[PDB]
Design a protein around this ligand. Structure first.
Ligand SMILES: [Fe+3]
Ligand SMILES: [Fe+3]
Ligand SMILES: [Fe+3]
Lengths: 307, 307, 307
């Protein structure tokens, strides 16, 4: 089936201590989200660059993790129903707040946690390169030679193109069908691993430390081992979803060369170019493409989506 | 009267070459905007820090211009009517595009140019500290001892607190009156120079290099001395504005100590605290406070607003 | 009117980490005291020297913050009624104990928090030097040219002379009137900003971590995220107060030259010398003069005292 994705965004300092606490406080949070029965998986990325579009963004590069001061992190979290997210965040509030507040000594911006729904998916299951001679055997056994996937190495061995679009009111489903068609054509590139399209449906306030007046002061004067009341969030998830339709396109690639030259096929390939020029005529903003590196993942989520 | 403010936002590399081209291409653009008769002034800022709210943003500091990789710039531009902006941007298109594209070799993000209207203003006119013995003389001459302002040094000798809020649908005018009242109380701080409140009304597409399909390719493959057609912008200014109403609060201070301890009066002062806790109960996001430094300005704009 | 001042005294290590936690845990505590309605303001000082009285204290100097191992800090806190202090300290006990115990890794002595009442006050309101052309305008408007004050820069731009006296039983009101008269004469110095006289009325036990037997062990074996019972304080505020009446004289000066040569006027000026020699004939101990530097302040307290 299709899960929803809550994405937790933050910007942190780029010190070694930041990565130490990524390695320490990272897994623990993941263990508190698994207490709910609707949780299906997770994936954690760090930004490593921006695709420069030639010289449209002349000061950006596909590798900037060396000469930089701030590192931006995005956590994907996959749910069967988006109310599972809102009922897990507030039943494990004591653990979650203190864990995520141990992280706040290094933050420059955020967190901001919006909620998206999957309107399209082409994601294969991940495997190692020692895990593929026993996968094609099972497929040729059951007489299914047309459903053997591409090898998709887990645990930080592939890149993600993270494209942000915002769409004019009155062009939404046009955008949706055009982008689906262009991905159908684009899956032909040498290195394409999978893709999905996400449509923003709302914003979570408890996951973004966004309280009313009483909770804001409790957040400001927190020594570390106390919590605000989680019911002091003034709005609900669908109450304030942004009017320009915000969409994410998440494409996977084997390496940054494949990323650079495959995402550029929509510019160089005349068929794909004419197909993609109906995406452009609906955008308020975009596309803005980030290059993400997946540090860790609950790979089993891809099982649920393909069951 | 009240002008509108178009704000041009960008993120650039933090090299010395960036500041060289700030000093060179900066004034020239300003000379092309002055060709329209509705242009009333301008102000240019660079971000120098983030107010950490104690340790809410633990990795931020009021001075980060040293240990950083990217510098964010915001240009204010003041218009009598927001259609003056849309008719100046496209009658000087040849000069403007090439000037602003000479800048694109150093950009990491943007530009994004939204359009705001002034709903409140308390801005005094700027003066040097050698310019104040001839100002009180004219005021005491005309028997007006209650309208002598505070000294507000121009050309980079004061700080700006740039607070971003977004408001829940259904709480807008409540936010407006509450924030006006809290600024009325807050003008008592030791170092307060002035303040204004801006309400986002739309987004300009020509000023953000946001074209359709035909113009996007012309932007991508531009050697430098060519222009896209400026009428290939798919949307108009009011067509796409955000669901949470985006407000800016722009407060001026003599120095960063006054900024740190005056913007904190809303937290420490019980009267001001209880007045300000009606602002907080309407926010989808915020407040997020940046510290800006004004490198240059068309100070005469403050004349028009106070005439 | 007149508030009471609770003064929190401590001695800490003089490392950079001490100042880091001053900048971090400092504001947060200040935000927890503002929850009571009787709280009117605050002021925080660090000791930077001792006035050597020629060579009476030959090893002391007006600047010792460089070659030193321990830094002594004094917090002033201003209350309408001294029971406001005792009812705020124990209703916010959970926040306050953990905040002030995060500080205990660097302490050499204290804290000791005695409670004083204001018997005399001459404190003007603080202003920046860009804030004074709009202050005299309002005063000349309302025909009040004799109540325009001296400029008193906030946020660490002035020095404090902190003089400690103790008075023989049977000489108290003699001391009081003599010191008031000598301050009336002394306000003539070139650089005098203001002064106040405080008379010690008692000691707070909850604010000095002074519990009985049950609470002392809870303080000793505290991991950090627990609290003693705040009602295990064996004595009340007026129960214990020193037999020699403890007085503080708090004088403000523009700079340490003005401090050195203005506090010495009582020695060099024959009129002031003969007036001040009735202060000396009542002292058990003193005067001992410290030089304080105000790092931060809730300046609005000076409004309440002058309303
Ligand atoms: Fe969440
Ligand atoms: Fe513009
Ligand atoms: Fe106390």
């Amino acid at each position: 089936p299709k899960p929803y994705v809550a994405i937790n965004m933050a910007e942190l300092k780029n010190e070694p201590k930041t990565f130490e606490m990524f390695a320490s406080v990272g897994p623990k949070v993941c263990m508190v989200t698994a207490r709910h029965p609707g949780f299906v998986g997770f994936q954690n990325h760090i930004q490593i660059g921006i695709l420069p579009f030639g010289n449209r963004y002349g000061g950006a590069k596909m590798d900037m993790t060396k000469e930089s001061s701030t590192v931006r992190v995005l956590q994907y979290t996959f749910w069967k129903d988006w109310k599972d997210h809102e009922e897990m965040h507030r039943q494990n509030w004591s653990y979650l707040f203190r864990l995520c507040y141990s992280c706040a000594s290094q933050m420059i911006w955020g967190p901001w946690e919006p909620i998206y729904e999957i309107i399209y998916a082409n994601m294969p299951i991940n495997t190692e390169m020692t895990d593929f001679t026993a996968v094609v055997g099972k497929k040729f056994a059951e007489g299914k030679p047309l459903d053997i996937p591409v090898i998709s190495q887990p645990y930080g061995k592939r890149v993600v193109a993270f494209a942000e679009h915002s769409v004019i009111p009155g062009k939404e489903k046009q955008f949706e069908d055009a982008i689906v068609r262009t991905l159908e054509m684009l899956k032909k590139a040498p290195g394409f691993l999978g893709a999905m399209v996400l449509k923003e449906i709302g914003v979570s306030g408890i996951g973004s430390m966004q309280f009313g007046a009483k909770g804001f002061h409790q957040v400001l004067e927190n020594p570390g081992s106390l919590e605000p009341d989680p019911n002091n969030v003034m709005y609900s998830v669908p109450e304030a979803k942004n009017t320009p339709q915000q969409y994410i396109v998440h494409v996977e690639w084997a390496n940054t060369d494949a990323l650079m030259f495959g995402m550029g096929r929509v510019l160089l390939y005349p068929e794909l170019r004419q197909v993609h020029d109906e995406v452009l005529d609906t955008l308020v903003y975009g596309p803005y493409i980030r290059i993400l590196n997946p540090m860790m993942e609950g790979t089993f989520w891809r099982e649920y989506l393909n069951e």
